[PDB]
Design a binder for this molecule. Structure first.
Ligand SMILES: [Ca+2]
Length: 141
């Protein structure tokens, strides 16, 4: 629930994703654990979808500052590349979007500058690539 004194509003929020493989259910990216080893149980996994995506529902409109996305680390780390992070309002209108080409480290941090949104979606833009996320943390500033 807090990370380095900052309230992670994504923690334990409802999630969904495009599909599930290897029991990589979407709630694994809001389980409070940043571990990126798939075999730990901390990491999501879809099938090879067109495209693969994951989403957290904050349950109401809230304010989105920092979004920190933690990749899988044990293998296939390149799969988290060429992807959008999209904010949606209560009517599922897109209110902001950032594109991430790839990660040089284990995570990427995006700042949505307090944009009002209820849903945050991570969407791969490459067909037929599974999406795996170790964790997605969302802060209000
Ligand atoms: Ca996790």
């Amino acid at each position: 629930k807090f990370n380095d004194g900052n309230l992670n509003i994504a923690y334990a929020k409802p999630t969904t994703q495009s599909s599930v493989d290897y029991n990589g259910d979407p709630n694994r990216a809001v389980d409070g654990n940043r571990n990126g080893n798939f075999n730990s149980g901390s990491v999501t996994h879809t099938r090879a979808d067109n495209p693969s995506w994951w989403e957290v529902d904050l349950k109401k409109m809230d304010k989105v500052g920092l979004v920190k996305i933690y990749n899988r680390t044990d293998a296939e780390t390149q799969r988290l590349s060429n992807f959008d992070v999209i904010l949606y309002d209560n009517n599922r209108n897109e209110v902001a979007k950032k594109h991430v080409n790839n990660l040089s480290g284990e995570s990427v941090s995006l700042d949505f500058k307090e944009k009002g949104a209820r849903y945050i979606k991570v969407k791969l833009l490459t067909s037929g690539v599974p999406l795996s996320l170790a964790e997605v943390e969302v802060f209000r500033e």
